[PDB]
Amino acid sequence: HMESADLRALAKHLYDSYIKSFPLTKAKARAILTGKTTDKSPFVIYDMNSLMMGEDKIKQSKEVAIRIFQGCQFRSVEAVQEITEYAKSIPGFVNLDLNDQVTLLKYGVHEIIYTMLASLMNKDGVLISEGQGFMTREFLKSLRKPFGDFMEPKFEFAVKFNALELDDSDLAIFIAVIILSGDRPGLLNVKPIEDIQDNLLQALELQLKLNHPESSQLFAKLLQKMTDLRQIVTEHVQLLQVIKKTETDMSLHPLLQEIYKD
Amino acid sequence: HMESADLRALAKHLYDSYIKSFPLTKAKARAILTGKTKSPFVIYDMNSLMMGEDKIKFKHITKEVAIRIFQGCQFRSVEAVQEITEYAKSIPGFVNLDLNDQVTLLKYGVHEIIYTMLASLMNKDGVLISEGQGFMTREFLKSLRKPFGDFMEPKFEFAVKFNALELDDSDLAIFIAVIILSGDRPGLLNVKPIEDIQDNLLQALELQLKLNHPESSQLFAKLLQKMTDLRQIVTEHVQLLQVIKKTETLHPLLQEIYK
Ligand SMILES: COc1ccc(COc2cc(C(=O)O)ccc2-c2nn(C(=O)c3c(Cl)cccc3C(F)(F)F)c3ccc(Cl)cc23)cc1
Numbered sequence: 340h341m342e343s344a345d346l347r348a349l350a351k352h353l354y355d356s357y358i359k360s361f362p363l364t365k366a367k368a369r370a371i372l373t374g375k376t377t378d379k380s381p382f383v384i385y386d387m388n389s390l391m392m393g394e395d396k397i398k399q400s401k402e403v404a405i406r407i408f409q410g411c412q413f414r415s416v417e418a419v420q421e422i423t424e425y426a427k428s429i430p431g432f433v434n435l436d437l438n439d440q441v442t443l444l445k446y447g448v449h450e451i452i453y454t455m456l457a458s459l460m461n462k463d464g465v466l467i468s469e470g471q472g473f474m475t476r477e478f479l480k481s482l483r484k485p486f487g488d489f490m491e492p493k494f495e496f497a498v499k500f501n502a503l504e505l506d507d508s509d510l511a512i513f514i515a516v517i518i519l520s521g522d523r524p525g526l527l528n529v530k531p532i533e534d535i536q537d538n539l540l541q542a543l544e545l546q547l548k549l550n551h552p553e554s555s556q557l558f559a560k561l562l563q564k565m566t567d568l569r570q571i572v573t574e575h576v577q578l579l580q581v582i583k584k585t586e587t588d589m590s591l592h593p594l595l596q597e598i599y600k601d
Numbered sequence: 602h603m604e605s606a607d608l609r610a611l612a613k614h615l616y617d618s619y620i621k622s623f624p625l626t627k628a629k630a631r632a633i634l635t636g637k638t639k640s641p642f643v644i645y646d647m648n649s650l651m652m653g654e655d656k657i658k659f660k661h662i663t664k665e666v667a668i669r670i671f672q673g674c675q676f677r678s679v680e681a682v683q684e685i686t687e688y689a690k691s692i693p694g695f696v697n698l699d700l701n702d703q704v705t706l707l708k709y710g711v712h713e714i715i716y717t718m719l720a721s722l723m724n725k726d727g728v729l730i731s732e733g734q735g736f737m738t739r740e741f742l743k744s745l746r747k748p749f750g751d752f753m754e755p756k757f758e759f760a761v762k763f764n765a766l767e768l769d770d771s772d773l774a775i776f777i778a779v780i781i782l783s784g785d786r787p788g789l790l791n792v793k794p795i796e797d798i799q800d801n802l803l804q805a806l807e808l809q810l811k812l813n814h815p816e817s818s819q820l821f822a823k824l825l826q827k828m829t830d831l832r833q834i835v836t837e838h839v840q841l842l843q844v845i846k847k848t849e850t851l852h853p854l855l856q857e858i859y860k
């Protein structure tokens with residue numbers, strides 16, 4: 340459909356914007372996690388005592404599980420802002436009907452947050468504070484009530500997603516494909532969204548073949564991962580609903596508040 | 602990896618087996634639904650249902666109307682499970698898998714393939730039954746009482762979207778094989794040969810769709826997306842089965858047949 344020279348151009352464009360939009364890349368996260376460096380090592384939070392020191396080292400007086408939860412939402416709000424900025428760079432997105440732009444972001448940001456959170460994860464924990472900290476999976480799993488169960492499904496996905504060994508240039512196109520989904524509820528003009536997604540899919544297909552030439556059917560394996568993404572988002576909102584019934588003492592950021600309607 | 606000549610041979614092998622395994626193909630069903638070919642008996646309300654149960658030889662009649670139709674769906678699904686089980690044995694490599702893994706793949710796969718293949722029998726207005734001798738309207742099914750009406754309509758809602766892809770039987774034979782060989786089913790013992798086979802099936806499906814739908818850009822990717830959806834739809838489906846088989850409280854022996 341599109342000449343390969345044009346598909347390579349689209350990949351370069353999107354990769355360029357991804358670097359401009361997202362401060363902590365997968366390449367940087369892997370350098371921090373795999374060590375070999377003395378200037379990039381994170382402070383590790385694994386228990387109540389190391390958390391207390393972490394607030395002093397890495398530089399709102401409530402229960403611990405609460406404090407950590409609000410820390411996540413703060414970062415999620417930032418991610419939404421970064422993702423919104425990235426989507427405006429996707430060719431054709433800002434030319435869509437304005438209601439559809441909103442609709443695509445509303446149902447797209449969480450699937451992308453989960454995708455990109457995997458970059459910050461290994462089987463034992465997750466980078467935080469722009470990579471200055473690292474909080475262990477075990478510590479997250481041991482938080483009380485429903486909060487302990489919140490964090491773990493992210494990890495089971497990440498371990499599976501990370502086995503695909505995608506780099507940032509692959510992820511930049513995958514993320515674009517997620518945003519331009521014509522099956523979001525309430526879309527007004529499905530067809531121009533599908534046309535954009537077709538080009539992005541072509542670009543993702545060629546990128547994955549060139550960048551992982553010994554990785555057979557990686558394109559198909561990557562698309563199937565959108566199953567896993569859909570299931571965790573559902574688990575996530577369902578757990579939020581429980582919290583929005585036990586903890587009437589707290590609420591969400593207006594941006595998250597509006598995202599989670601319908 | 603696989604030579605193109607080998608992928609076509611695999612596509613042909615699967616097509617031939619699919620034609621032998623399934624009584625009513627998509628091509629035959631489309632002929633019936635479009636009137637392009639003895640008209641099927643139409644069930645559109647309570648009175649014609651009663652006549653249809655007499656004229657058509659329903660094998661499942663042993664209660665309330667909405668119940669009876671539900672039991673017919675179950676009867677036909679149990680039939681389909683055996684038809685799919687027979688088809689999977691023709692998939693190159695399947696019978697050499699560990700026997701527990703063969704069972705596991707079928708246990709979690711049949712529901713997705715039944716939904717997929719039910720689309721072949723559907724249009725926006727109803728569904729073929731009894732090997733195409735009957736046709737029950739969408740409207741009559743949607744209007745069934747308590748949860749039964751909302752049970753039937755999601756099948757149609759999927760089918761309308763899936764059918765816009767305009768796959769034919771030779772496309773579907775490979776797609777069905779791909780679903781069966783899913784290496785992420787829980788409880789699998791030896792994932793590697795399952796993913797290896799699926800890798801070859803995926804190669805064959807990609808080539809089939811390019812030759813058979815050369816004007817249909819990224820149809821391969823679009824179909825893979827539908828395999829995703831199927832996962833969520835089956836989950837909603839089974840949950841509703843649990844409710845219907847719990848809120849709508851027959852014989853213990855029939856209960857075991859439909860476990
Ligand atoms: C103590 O300090 C911190 C501690 C943890 C974090 C979380 O790390 C993330 C990083 C990014 C990043 O950097 O892109 C992005 C997300 C998180 C993160 N969100 N989240 C949530 O529950 C969440 C999500 Cl997904 C989406 C919307 C709303 C929410 C929330 F409202 F319900 F909260 C997580 C749950 C578990 C884990 Cl392990 C990570 C996340 C940040 C700082």
Ligand SMILES: COc1ccc(COc2cc(C(=O)O)ccc2-c2nn(C(=O)c3c(Cl)cccc3C(F)(F)F)c3ccc(Cl)cc23)cc1
Pocket residue numbers: 669670671673674675676677678681712715716718719722728729730731737742752753756842
């Ligand atoms: C006299 O009444 C009828 C007799 C036969 C039919 C034909 O129905 C099918 C045919 C095939 C065929 O021929 O390939 C295949 C499927 C059905 C059919 N399954 N199904 C289900 O709920 C269902 C499904 Cl999807 C998957 C797994 C298990 C089940 C079940 F266990 F929960 F049942 C339906 C729901 C609605 C409709 Cl409209 C059709 C189906 C319809 C009505």
